[PDB]
Coordinates of C-alpha atoms and ligand atoms in Angstrom, one line a residue:
Chain A
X1 CA -18.5 58.8 2.9
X2 CA -16.6 58.7 -0.5
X3 CA -13.2 58.6 1.3
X4 CA -13.9 55.3 3.0
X5 CA -15.2 53.9 -0.3
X6 CA -12.1 54.6 -2.4
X7 CA -9.9 53.3 0.5
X8 CA -11.8 50.0 0.6
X9 CA -11.5 49.7 -3.2
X10 CA -7.7 50.3 -3.1
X11 CA -7.2 47.7 -0.3
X12 CA -9.5 45.2 -2.2
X13 CA -7.5 45.6 -5.4
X14 CA -4.1 45.2 -3.7
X15 CA -5.0 42.0 -1.9
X16 CA -7.1 40.5 -4.7
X17 CA -4.2 40.9 -7.1
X18 CA -2.0 38.7 -4.8
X19 CA -4.5 36.0 -3.9
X20 CA -6.0 35.7 -7.4
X21 CA -2.5 35.3 -8.8
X22 CA -1.8 32.5 -6.3
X23 CA -5.1 30.8 -7.2
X24 CA -4.3 31.0 -11.0
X25 CA -1.0 29.2 -10.4
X26 CA -2.8 26.3 -8.6
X27 CA -5.6 26.3 -11.2
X28 CA -3.0 26.1 -14.1
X29 CA -1.2 23.3 -12.3
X30 CA -4.3 21.2 -12.1
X31 CA -5.5 22.1 -15.7
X32 CA -2.1 21.2 -17.2
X33 CA -1.6 18.1 -15.0
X34 CA -4.6 16.3 -13.5
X35 CA -3.4 14.3 -10.5
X36 CA -4.6 13.7 -6.9
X37 CA -1.8 16.0 -5.7
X38 CA -2.7 19.0 -7.9
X39 CA -6.4 18.5 -7.3
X40 CA -5.9 18.6 -3.5
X41 CA -3.9 21.8 -3.7
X42 CA -6.5 23.5 -6.0
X43 CA -9.3 22.6 -3.5
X44 CA -7.2 24.1 -0.6
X45 CA -6.6 27.2 -2.7
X46 CA -10.3 27.5 -3.3
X47 CA -10.9 27.8 0.4
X48 CA -8.2 30.4 0.7
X49 CA -9.6 32.6 -2.0
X50 CA -13.1 32.3 -0.4
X51 CA -11.9 33.5 2.9
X52 CA -10.6 36.6 1.1
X53 CA -13.9 36.9 -0.8
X54 CA -16.0 36.5 2.4
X55 CA -13.9 39.1 4.2
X56 CA -14.0 41.9 1.6
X57 CA -17.5 41.0 0.4
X58 CA -18.9 41.3 3.9
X59 CA -17.3 44.7 4.2
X60 CA -18.6 45.7 0.8
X61 CA -22.2 45.1 1.9
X62 CA -21.9 47.7 4.6
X63 CA -21.6 50.4 1.9
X64 CA -24.8 51.8 0.3
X65 CA -23.7 51.5 -3.3
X66 CA -26.4 54.0 -4.5
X67 CA -25.4 56.7 -2.1
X68 CA -21.9 56.9 -3.7
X69 CA -20.8 59.8 -6.0
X70 CA -18.1 58.0 -8.1
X71 CA -19.4 55.6 -10.8
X72 CA -16.1 53.7 -11.1
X73 CA -16.0 53.1 -7.4
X74 CA -19.8 52.3 -7.5
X75 CA -19.3 49.5 -10.0
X76 CA -16.5 47.9 -8.0
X77 CA -18.1 47.8 -4.6
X78 CA -21.4 46.5 -6.1
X79 CA -19.4 43.6 -7.7
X80 CA -17.6 42.9 -4.4
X81 CA -20.9 42.6 -2.7
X82 CA -21.5 39.5 -4.7
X83 CA -19.6 36.7 -3.0
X84 CA -20.4 34.0 -5.6
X85 CA -19.7 30.5 -4.2
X86 CA -18.0 32.1 -1.0
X87 CA -21.6 32.9 0.2
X88 CA -22.1 29.2 0.9
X89 CA -21.5 27.8 4.4
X90 CA -18.1 26.1 4.8
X91 CA -19.1 22.4 4.3
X92 CA -21.4 23.2 1.3
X93 CA -18.6 25.2 -0.3
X94 CA -16.1 22.3 0.0
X95 CA -18.8 19.9 -1.4
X96 CA -19.5 22.3 -4.3
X97 CA -15.7 22.7 -5.0
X98 CA -15.3 18.9 -5.0
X99 CA -18.3 18.4 -7.3
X100 CA -16.9 20.9 -9.8
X101 CA -13.5 19.2 -9.8
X102 CA -15.1 15.8 -10.1
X103 CA -17.2 16.8 -13.1
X104 CA -14.2 18.5 -14.7
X105 CA -11.9 15.5 -14.2
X106 CA -14.5 13.0 -15.3
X107 CA -15.0 15.0 -18.6
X108 CA -11.3 15.4 -19.2
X109 CA -10.2 11.8 -18.7
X110 CA -13.3 10.1 -20.4
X111 CA -12.4 7.7 -23.2
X112 CA -14.3 5.6 -25.8
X113 CA -12.8 2.2 -26.4
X114 CA -12.9 -0.5 -29.0
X115 CA -13.4 -3.8 -27.1
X116 CA -9.9 -5.3 -26.5
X117 CA -8.6 -2.4 -28.7
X118 CA -7.6 1.3 -28.7
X119 CA -9.2 3.9 -26.4
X120 CA -10.0 7.2 -28.1
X121 CA -10.0 10.6 -26.4
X122 CA -12.3 13.5 -27.4
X123 CA -9.3 15.5 -28.6
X124 CA -8.0 14.6 -31.1
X125 CA -9.4 11.2 -31.8
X126 CA -13.2 11.5 -31.6
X127 CA -13.0 15.0 -33.0
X128 CA -11.2 13.6 -36.1
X129 CA -13.7 10.7 -36.5
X130 CA -16.6 13.2 -36.4
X131 CA -14.8 15.6 -38.9
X132 CA -13.7 13.0 -41.5
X133 CA -15.7 9.8 -41.4
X134 CA -18.5 9.6 -44.0
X135 CA -19.8 6.2 -42.7
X136 CA -23.1 6.4 -40.8
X137 CA -22.4 3.7 -38.3
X138 CA -18.8 4.8 -37.5
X139 CA -20.2 8.3 -36.8
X140 CA -22.9 6.8 -34.6
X141 CA -20.3 4.8 -32.7
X142 CA -18.3 7.9 -31.8
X143 CA -21.4 10.0 -31.1
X144 CA -23.2 7.5 -28.9
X145 CA -19.9 6.4 -27.3
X146 CA -19.0 9.9 -26.2
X147 CA -22.4 10.3 -24.6
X148 CA -22.3 6.9 -23.0
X149 CA -18.9 7.6 -21.4
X150 CA -18.8 11.3 -20.7
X151 CA -22.5 12.4 -20.6
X152 CA -23.7 9.5 -18.4
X153 CA -20.8 9.9 -16.0
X154 CA -21.7 13.5 -15.3
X155 CA -25.3 12.8 -14.4
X156 CA -24.5 11.6 -10.8
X157 CA -23.1 15.1 -10.0
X158 CA -25.4 17.5 -11.8
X159 CA -28.5 17.7 -9.5
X160 CA -26.3 18.5 -6.4
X161 CA -24.3 21.0 -8.5
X162 CA -27.5 22.7 -9.5
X163 CA -28.8 22.8 -5.9
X164 CA -25.5 24.3 -4.7
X165 CA -25.0 26.9 -7.4
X166 CA -28.6 28.1 -7.0
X167 CA -28.1 28.3 -3.2
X168 CA -25.0 30.5 -3.8
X169 CA -27.0 32.7 -6.2
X170 CA -29.9 33.1 -3.7
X171 CA -27.5 34.0 -0.9
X172 CA -26.1 36.7 -3.2
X173 CA -29.6 38.2 -3.8
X174 CA -30.5 36.5 -7.1
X175 CA -33.4 34.1 -7.6
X176 CA -31.3 31.3 -9.2
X177 CA -27.9 30.7 -10.9
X178 CA -29.4 31.7 -14.4
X179 CA -30.5 35.0 -13.0
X180 CA -27.0 35.5 -11.6
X181 CA -25.4 34.6 -14.9
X182 CA -27.7 36.9 -17.1
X183 CA -26.9 39.8 -14.8
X184 CA -23.3 39.9 -16.1
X185 CA -24.8 41.8 -19.1
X186 CA -26.5 44.5 -17.0
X187 CA -29.2 44.5 -19.6
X188 CA -32.8 44.2 -18.2
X189 CA -34.2 43.3 -21.6
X190 CA -31.5 40.7 -22.4
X191 CA -33.9 37.8 -23.0
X192 CA -36.1 39.9 -25.4
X193 CA -33.0 41.2 -27.2
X194 CA -31.6 37.7 -27.7
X195 CA -34.9 36.3 -28.9
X196 CA -35.3 39.0 -31.6
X197 CA -31.7 38.4 -32.8
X198 CA -32.4 34.7 -33.0
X199 CA -35.6 35.4 -34.9
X200 CA -33.8 37.6 -37.4
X201 CA -31.4 34.8 -38.3
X202 CA -34.1 32.2 -38.8
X203 CA -34.6 32.7 -42.6
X204 CA -30.8 32.2 -43.1
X205 CA -30.6 29.2 -40.8
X206 CA -33.7 27.4 -42.2
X207 CA -32.4 27.9 -45.8
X208 CA -28.9 26.6 -44.8
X209 CA -30.6 23.7 -42.8
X210 CA -32.8 22.7 -45.8
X211 CA -29.9 22.8 -48.3
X212 CA -27.6 20.7 -46.0
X213 CA -30.4 18.2 -45.3
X214 CA -30.8 17.6 -49.1
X215 CA -27.0 17.1 -49.5
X216 CA -27.1 14.6 -46.6
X217 CA -30.1 12.9 -48.2
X218 CA -27.9 12.4 -51.4
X219 CA -24.9 11.0 -49.5
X220 CA -26.5 8.9 -46.6
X221 CA -29.5 7.7 -48.5
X222 CA -33.2 8.3 -48.7
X223 CA -33.9 5.7 -46.0
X224 CA -31.9 7.7 -43.5
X225 CA -32.9 11.3 -44.2
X226 CA -36.4 12.7 -44.0
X227 CA -36.6 15.8 -46.3
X228 CA -39.4 17.2 -44.1
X229 CA -37.9 16.2 -40.7
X230 CA -35.1 17.0 -38.4
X231 CA -31.5 16.0 -39.3
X232 CA -29.8 13.2 -37.3
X233 CA -27.3 14.9 -34.9
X234 CA -24.2 12.9 -35.8
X235 CA -24.0 13.8 -39.4
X236 CA -22.7 17.4 -39.3
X237 CA -18.9 17.0 -39.0
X238 CA -18.8 18.0 -35.3
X239 CA -19.5 16.1 -32.1
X240 CA -22.3 18.5 -31.0
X241 CA -23.4 19.5 -34.5
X242 CA -22.7 23.1 -33.3
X243 CA -20.6 24.0 -36.4
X244 CA -20.9 22.2 -39.7
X245 CA -17.8 23.3 -41.7
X246 CA -16.3 19.8 -41.8
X247 CA -19.0 18.5 -44.1
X248 CA -18.2 21.2 -46.7
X249 CA -17.1 18.5 -49.2
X250 CA -20.7 17.1 -49.1
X251 CA -22.4 20.4 -49.6
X252 CA -20.1 22.5 -51.8
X253 CA -22.3 24.7 -54.2
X254 CA -19.8 24.5 -57.0
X255 CA -17.6 21.4 -57.1
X256 CA -16.3 22.7 -60.4
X257 CA -14.7 25.5 -58.4
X258 CA -12.5 23.3 -56.1
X259 CA -10.4 24.8 -53.3
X260 CA -7.1 23.7 -51.8
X261 CA -7.1 21.2 -49.0
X262 CA -6.0 23.5 -46.2
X263 CA -4.9 20.8 -43.7
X264 CA -2.5 19.1 -46.2
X265 CA -1.1 22.5 -47.1
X266 CA -0.5 23.3 -43.5
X267 CA 1.1 19.9 -42.9
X268 CA 3.1 19.9 -46.1
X269 CA 4.4 23.4 -45.6
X270 CA 5.5 22.6 -42.0
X271 CA 3.0 24.6 -39.9
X272 CA 3.2 23.8 -36.2
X273 CA 1.1 24.8 -33.1
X274 CA 3.8 27.5 -32.4
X275 CA 3.7 29.0 -35.9
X276 CA -0.1 29.0 -35.8
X277 CA 0.0 31.2 -32.6
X278 CA 2.8 33.3 -34.1
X279 CA 0.6 34.0 -37.2
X280 CA -2.2 35.1 -34.9
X281 CA 0.3 37.3 -33.0
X282 CA 1.4 38.8 -36.3
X283 CA -2.1 39.7 -37.3
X284 CA -2.7 41.5 -33.9
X285 CA 0.6 43.5 -34.2
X286 CA -0.2 44.4 -37.8
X287 CA -3.2 46.3 -36.5
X288 CA -0.8 48.2 -34.2
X289 CA -2.1 46.1 -31.3
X290 CA 0.1 44.6 -28.5
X291 CA 2.4 41.6 -29.0
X292 CA 2.3 38.8 -26.5
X293 CA 5.2 39.0 -23.9
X294 CA 8.2 36.7 -24.1
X295 CA 6.9 34.8 -21.0
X296 CA 3.8 33.7 -23.0
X297 CA 5.9 31.5 -25.2
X298 CA 7.8 30.1 -22.2
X299 CA 4.8 29.2 -20.0
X300 CA 2.0 28.3 -22.5
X301 CA 0.9 24.8 -23.3
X302 CA 0.2 25.1 -27.0
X303 CA 0.0 21.3 -27.7
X304 CA -1.1 18.1 -26.0
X305 CA 1.6 16.6 -23.7
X306 CA 3.3 13.4 -24.8
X307 CA 4.5 12.2 -21.3
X308 CA 1.1 10.5 -20.9
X309 CA -0.2 13.0 -18.3
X310 CA -3.9 14.0 -18.1
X311 CA -4.8 17.6 -19.0
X312 CA -7.9 19.7 -19.6
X313 CA -7.6 19.9 -23.4
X314 CA -10.3 22.5 -24.1
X315 CA -8.7 25.6 -25.5
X316 CA -8.5 28.4 -22.9
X317 CA -6.7 31.7 -22.2
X318 CA -5.3 32.6 -18.8
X319 CA -4.9 36.0 -17.0
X320 CA -2.6 35.5 -14.0
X321 CA -3.7 39.0 -12.6
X322 CA -0.1 40.2 -12.7
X323 CA -0.1 42.4 -15.8
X324 CA 2.8 40.3 -17.0
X325 CA 1.8 36.7 -17.1
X326 CA -0.7 35.6 -19.8
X327 CA -1.0 32.0 -21.1
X328 CA -2.9 29.8 -23.6
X329 CA -3.6 26.2 -22.9
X330 CA -4.8 24.4 -26.0
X331 CA -4.3 20.8 -27.4
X332 CA -3.7 22.3 -30.9
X333 CA -3.9 20.2 -34.0
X334 CA -2.4 21.4 -37.3
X335 CA -5.5 22.4 -39.3
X336 CA -7.5 25.4 -40.4
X337 CA -10.1 25.0 -37.6
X338 CA -7.5 25.2 -34.9
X339 CA -5.9 28.2 -36.6
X340 CA -9.3 29.9 -36.2
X341 CA -9.3 28.7 -32.6
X342 CA -5.8 30.1 -32.1
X343 CA -7.0 33.6 -33.2
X344 CA -10.0 33.3 -30.9
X345 CA -7.8 32.5 -27.8
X346 CA -5.3 35.2 -28.8
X347 CA -8.2 37.7 -28.8
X348 CA -8.6 36.9 -25.0
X349 CA -4.9 37.5 -24.4
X350 CA -5.0 40.8 -26.3
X351 CA -8.0 41.9 -24.1
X352 CA -5.9 40.9 -21.0
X353 CA -3.0 43.1 -22.1
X354 CA -5.2 46.0 -23.0
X355 CA -6.8 46.4 -19.6
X356 CA -4.0 45.2 -17.4
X357 CA -3.6 48.7 -15.8
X358 CA -7.2 48.8 -14.6
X359 CA -8.1 47.8 -11.0
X360 CA -8.3 43.9 -11.0
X361 CA -12.0 44.2 -10.3
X362 CA -12.5 45.8 -13.7
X363 CA -10.3 43.4 -15.6
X364 CA -13.1 41.7 -17.6
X365 CA -14.7 42.3 -21.0
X366 CA -17.4 45.0 -21.5
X367 CA -19.6 42.0 -21.3
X368 CA -18.7 38.3 -21.6
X369 CA -19.7 38.3 -25.4
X370 CA -17.1 41.1 -26.0
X371 CA -14.3 38.9 -24.7
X372 CA -15.3 36.1 -27.0
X373 CA -15.7 38.3 -30.1
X374 CA -12.3 40.0 -30.3
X375 CA -10.2 37.1 -31.7
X376 CA -13.1 36.0 -34.0
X377 CA -13.2 39.5 -35.6
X378 CA -9.6 39.1 -36.7
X379 CA -10.2 35.5 -37.7
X380 CA -13.0 36.7 -40.1
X381 CA -10.3 38.6 -42.1
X382 CA -7.8 35.6 -41.7
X383 CA -10.6 33.4 -43.3
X384 CA -10.9 35.3 -46.5
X385 CA -9.7 33.5 -49.6
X386 CA -7.5 36.5 -50.4
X387 CA -5.7 36.2 -47.0
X388 CA -5.6 32.4 -47.0
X389 CA -3.9 32.5 -50.4
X390 CA -1.4 35.0 -49.0
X391 CA -0.6 32.3 -46.4
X392 CA -0.2 29.7 -49.3
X393 CA -3.2 27.8 -47.9
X394 CA -5.5 28.4 -50.8
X395 CA -4.9 28.9 -54.5
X396 CA -15.0 33.9 -59.3
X397 CA -18.7 34.0 -58.6
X398 CA -18.7 30.3 -58.0
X399 CA -15.7 30.6 -55.6
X400 CA -17.5 33.5 -53.9
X401 CA -20.7 31.4 -53.2
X402 CA -18.4 28.5 -52.2
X403 CA -16.7 30.7 -49.6
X404 CA -19.9 32.1 -48.2
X405 CA -21.3 28.6 -47.8
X406 CA -18.1 27.5 -46.0
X407 CA -18.5 30.5 -43.6
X408 CA -22.3 29.9 -43.1
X409 CA -21.6 26.3 -42.1
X410 CA -19.7 27.6 -39.0
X411 CA -21.2 31.0 -38.3
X412 CA -24.9 30.5 -39.2
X413 CA -25.2 26.9 -37.9
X414 CA -23.8 28.0 -34.5
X415 CA -26.5 30.6 -34.0
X416 CA -29.3 28.2 -32.9
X417 CA -26.9 26.0 -30.9
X418 CA -25.3 28.8 -29.0
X419 CA -28.8 30.1 -28.2
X420 CA -30.1 26.6 -27.0
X421 CA -27.5 25.7 -24.4
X422 CA -28.4 28.4 -21.9
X423 CA -32.1 28.2 -22.8
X424 CA -31.9 24.7 -21.4
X425 CA -29.7 25.8 -18.4
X426 CA -31.7 28.8 -17.3
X427 CA -34.7 26.5 -17.1
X428 CA -32.8 23.9 -15.1
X429 CA -31.6 26.7 -12.8
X430 CA -35.1 28.1 -12.5
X431 CA -36.7 24.7 -11.8
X432 CA -38.7 24.5 -15.1
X433 CA -36.7 21.5 -16.1
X434 CA -36.2 18.9 -13.3
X435 CA -33.7 16.0 -13.2
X436 CA -36.3 13.6 -14.6
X437 CA -36.7 15.8 -17.6
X438 CA -33.0 16.9 -18.2
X439 CA -32.5 14.8 -21.4
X440 CA -36.0 14.9 -22.9
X441 CA -36.1 18.7 -22.6
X442 CA -32.5 19.0 -24.1
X443 CA -33.7 17.1 -27.2
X444 CA -36.9 19.2 -27.3
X445 CA -34.8 22.3 -27.6
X446 CA -32.4 20.6 -30.0
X447 CA -35.4 20.0 -32.2
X448 CA -37.1 23.4 -31.7
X449 CA -34.0 25.5 -32.3
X450 CA -31.6 23.4 -34.5
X451 CA -34.0 21.0 -36.2
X452 CA -31.9 18.0 -35.1
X453 CA -32.9 14.7 -33.7
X454 CA -30.8 12.0 -32.0
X455 CA -29.7 9.2 -34.4
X456 CA -30.6 6.7 -31.7
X457 CA -33.3 6.8 -29.0
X458 CA -32.2 8.1 -25.7
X459 CA -32.4 5.8 -22.6
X460 CA -32.9 6.2 -18.9
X461 CA -29.5 7.4 -17.5
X462 CA -28.6 9.5 -20.6
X463 CA -27.4 13.0 -19.9
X464 CA -26.3 14.3 -23.3
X465 CA -25.8 17.9 -22.0
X466 CA -23.0 16.3 -19.8
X467 CA -21.1 15.5 -23.0
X468 CA -20.6 19.2 -23.9
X469 CA -17.6 20.7 -22.1
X470 CA -19.3 23.9 -20.7
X471 CA -22.0 21.9 -18.8
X472 CA -19.7 20.0 -16.4
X473 CA -17.2 22.9 -16.5
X474 CA -20.0 25.3 -15.4
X475 CA -19.1 27.9 -18.1
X476 CA -22.0 30.1 -19.2
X477 CA -22.7 29.7 -22.9
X478 CA -24.9 32.7 -24.0
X479 CA -21.6 34.7 -24.4
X480 CA -20.9 32.7 -27.6
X481 CA -24.3 33.6 -29.1
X482 CA -23.7 37.3 -28.3
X483 CA -20.1 36.9 -29.7
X484 CA -21.3 35.6 -33.1
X485 CA -23.8 38.5 -33.5
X486 CA -21.5 41.3 -32.4
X487 CA -18.3 40.1 -34.2
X488 CA -20.0 40.9 -37.6
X489 CA -21.0 44.3 -36.2
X490 CA -17.3 44.8 -35.3
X491 CA -16.2 43.5 -38.7
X492 CA -18.5 45.9 -40.6
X493 CA -17.3 48.9 -38.5
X494 CA -13.6 48.1 -38.7
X495 CA -13.9 47.5 -42.5
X496 CA -15.3 51.0 -43.1
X497 CA -12.8 52.3 -40.6
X498 CA -10.1 50.8 -42.8
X499 CA -11.8 52.5 -45.9
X500 CA -12.8 49.2 -47.6
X501 CA -15.7 49.3 -49.9
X502 CA -17.7 46.6 -51.7
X503 CA -19.3 43.4 -50.3
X504 CA -18.7 42.9 -46.5
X505 CA -17.5 39.3 -46.9
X506 CA -14.6 40.4 -49.1
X507 CA -13.1 42.7 -46.4
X508 CA -9.7 42.0 -45.0
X509 CA -8.6 44.4 -42.2
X510 CA -4.9 43.1 -42.2
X511 CA -2.4 45.8 -41.2
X512 CA -5.1 48.5 -40.5
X513 CA -4.0 50.8 -37.7
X514 CA -7.4 52.6 -37.8
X515 CA -9.1 49.2 -37.1
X516 CA -6.6 48.5 -34.3
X517 CA -7.1 51.8 -32.6
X518 CA -10.9 51.3 -32.5
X519 CA -10.6 47.9 -30.9
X520 CA -7.9 49.2 -28.5
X521 CA -9.9 52.1 -27.0
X522 CA -12.9 49.8 -26.4
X523 CA -10.8 47.0 -24.8
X524 CA -8.9 49.4 -22.5
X525 CA -12.3 50.2 -20.8
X526 CA -12.5 46.6 -19.4
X527 CA -15.6 46.4 -17.2
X528 CA -15.3 50.1 -16.1
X529 CA -18.3 51.3 -18.2
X530 CA -21.6 49.8 -19.3
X531 CA -21.1 47.7 -22.5
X532 CA -23.1 50.0 -24.8
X533 CA -20.2 52.5 -24.4
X534 CA -17.7 50.0 -25.8
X535 CA -20.3 49.1 -28.5
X536 CA -20.6 52.8 -29.4
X537 CA -16.8 53.3 -29.6
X538 CA -16.3 50.4 -32.0
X539 CA -19.5 50.7 -34.2
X540 CA -20.8 54.2 -33.9
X541 CA -24.0 52.9 -32.3
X542 CA -25.0 51.3 -28.9
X543 CA -27.1 48.2 -29.8
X544 CA -26.6 44.5 -30.5
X545 CA -27.8 44.1 -34.1
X546 CA -28.1 41.2 -36.6
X547 CA -27.9 43.6 -39.5
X548 CA -24.2 43.2 -40.1
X549 CA -24.3 39.4 -40.1
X550 CA -27.3 39.5 -42.5
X551 CA -25.4 41.9 -44.8
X552 CA -22.3 39.6 -44.7
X553 CA -24.4 36.6 -45.9
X554 CA -26.9 38.5 -48.1
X555 CA -25.6 37.0 -51.4
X556 CA -25.8 33.5 -49.8
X557 CA -29.4 34.0 -48.6
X558 CA -30.4 35.0 -52.2
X559 CA -28.6 31.9 -53.7
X560 CA -30.0 29.5 -51.1
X561 CA -33.6 30.7 -51.6
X562 CA -33.2 30.2 -55.3
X563 CA -31.7 26.7 -54.9
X564 CA -34.2 25.5 -52.2
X565 CA -37.2 26.8 -54.2
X566 CA -36.1 25.0 -57.4
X567 CA -35.5 21.7 -55.5
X568 CA -38.9 22.1 -53.8
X569 CA -37.5 22.0 -50.2
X570 CA -39.9 22.5 -47.3
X571 CA -38.2 25.0 -45.0
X572 CA -38.2 23.9 -41.4
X573 CA -39.2 20.5 -40.1
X574 CA -43.0 20.1 -40.3
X575 CA -42.7 16.4 -39.5
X576 CA -41.0 17.3 -36.2
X577 CA -41.8 13.9 -34.6
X578 CA -39.7 12.0 -37.1
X579 CA -36.7 10.0 -35.8
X580 CA -34.5 7.5 -37.6
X581 CA -36.1 4.1 -38.4
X582 CA -32.6 2.9 -39.1
Chain B
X1 CA -9.3 34.5 -14.9
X2 CA -9.8 31.7 -17.5
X3 CA -11.7 32.2 -20.8
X4 CA -12.6 29.4 -23.2
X5 CA -14.1 28.9 -26.7
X6 CA -17.4 27.5 -28.1
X7 CA -17.0 27.4 -27.7
Ligands
LIG601 C1 -13.8 58.2 -10.0 O1 -12.7 57.4 -9.6 C2 -11.9 57.0 -10.6 C3 -10.8 56.0 -10.1 O2 -10.2 56.5 -8.9 C4 -11.2 58.1 -11.4 O3 -10.7 57.6 -12.6 C5 -9.4 58.1 -12.9 O4 -9.3 59.3 -13.5 C6 -8.0 59.8 -13.9 C7 -8.2 61.1 -14.6 O5 -8.8 62.0 -13.7 C8 -7.4 58.7 -14.9 O6 -6.1 59.2 -15.4 C9 -5.9 58.7 -16.8 O7 -5.0 57.7 -16.9 C10 -3.6 58.0 -17.0 C11 -2.8 57.5 -15.8 O8 -3.4 57.9 -14.6 C12 -3.3 59.5 -17.2 O9 -2.0 59.7 -17.7 C13 -4.3 60.1 -18.2 O10 -4.0 61.5 -18.5 C14 -5.8 59.9 -17.8 O11 -6.3 61.1 -17.2 C15 -7.3 57.4 -14.2 O12 -6.8 56.4 -15.1 C16 -8.7 57.0 -13.7 N1 -8.6 55.7 -12.9 C17 -9.3 54.7 -13.2 C18 -9.1 53.5 -12.4 O13 -10.1 54.6 -14.2 C19 -12.3 59.2 -11.8 O14 -11.7 60.4 -12.1 C20 -13.3 59.5 -10.7 N2 -14.4 60.2 -11.2 C21 -14.8 61.4 -10.7 C22 -16.0 62.0 -11.4 O15 -14.3 62.0 -9.8
NAG602 C1 2.7 16.8 -12.7 O1 2.3 16.4 -11.5 C2 3.4 15.9 -10.8 C3 2.9 15.1 -9.5 O2 2.5 13.9 -9.9 C4 4.4 17.1 -10.4 O3 5.4 16.6 -9.6 C5 4.9 17.7 -11.7 O4 5.6 18.8 -11.5 C6 3.7 18.0 -12.6 N1 4.1 18.5 -14.0 C7 4.5 17.6 -14.9 C8 4.8 18.2 -16.2 O5 4.5 16.4 -14.7
CL603 CL1 -26.2 16.1 -27.8
CL604 CL1 -22.2 34.7 -20.5
ZN605 ZN1 -13.2 32.3 -25.9

């Protein structure tokens, strides 16, 4: 009956709270200090948490979820029926846990070295090279080097990882791991929805792509850029060419409308990692939202350690399942990019604090895309020239188009990349792409979606997906695609909630209590209701929609079409088989 | 648990 159901849920929540808190401590200890000792402890704590998952998960499966009255209790028990990795037999589980840790450690300690010289780490060294160098061969060195050292080293683990994660998925009632991952959205038409959203943003991407390709042609020379072909993947200012904002100087629509160098400003004016997170905190509280607790500042790792110890540098936010302990771990560099990243991570923390009073089983975003979007929404307002000037980091129509271009280089360029990652992965999980086709199929999608080509031919042993954090880390990626669509939807709604009129891209929601209240009511729901409810509460409607993003960039689309047509650009890459002759 | 970035 209903009495036995709510009793079970209560017991589950009490015990999960304690054991997940213990696991988090062990996880944090490894992530902020990679050693044999901390690795061993984490693997042991994995086994502990799995015994808890198996125990309650087995009990959960005795309940007929669809015979239960209460929909909150229904959602919890259904979720507990999914054991995840704990469904695996003991020895397979320990193998799986070891594989995950080996992949993570391998990625986190990988270096690219000059012969008899310095060894560069991904953050900050190779990131800086990719962002600042305008020398074809130096960029190639970093790009190829990272894939030679990180990508190739991951390959030996990946097939077995795939086999084990699929096995876990099947034992939990899914057909493969991709099926399992997509189900987090509880949206049967997810694939169709995502495809249509991608389609709607093609005109804008193809126009941005063609404009950038022309600018690259001017800088790197006619012998190295085919104006009707894909762009070499090492030229976009980012290791994965996932965001292109670092090549702004090469593409600026109006050089006669120059903007302040934001990095120098931050460095000259004495910005620090701590002050960067404080400014994000200040934006959140200005909306009437919650401040981070005192403990956050005591326990967080907001910069790379100097005692030579190995860490997982990739920015992350941590819920210790206590309602009190929340942390950010980020190897922060003093620049505008990482200020944006800081807001993103603080969005996660805000979400943690908003739903901390829910049962632990419901302490998640409405869907994974929602969790990613929160910080980005506020960052959109932070990014406005108006607001950046108020922070003394920047000093009309030309500047407007300049700004839109700058925003498109991050936001628009990321749409096809964030779509591609899990398109590749779902097909690996479903067996459509085998281990013999891993890399070739990755570059087929890189071409199809992004219009990029590798600068150098790929060889046997290459596993370029391995060189992207989320692949060895086993973190789903489609959430970021969803995030980039919906954050503009959130922006549009919060802007009219704040009374702002005029072009969407000029909106700054700073200090708006009405905008804060709308985000708050949705965030408080956690995972307790289907996501269209949270979507409805923020936006006044229940769908994912590209309309807001299109509206934001409307003036840029018009300007790009004009510019591309007058320069005679072919939109797309008709000569799709072109690769560098170099 | 732990939530990242593009990311
Ligand atoms: C199904 O079960 C859930 C969980 O046991 C019930 O949800 C609970 O509903 C009460 C109101 O009836 C919520 O109280 C609310 O929060 C605060 C503190 O309790 C209170 O001051 C407010 O006035 C407000 O009413 C409670 O938070 C909520 N619990 C959870 C976990 O969401 C629900 O009522 C049951 N549904 C049915 C149809 O019986
Ligand atoms: C790092 O790991 C060592 C064990 O090698 C441990 O004793 C120490 O507490 C950890 N933390 C730091 C900051 O070194
Ligand atoms: Cl790549
Ligand atoms: Cl996801
Ligand atoms: Zn994130």
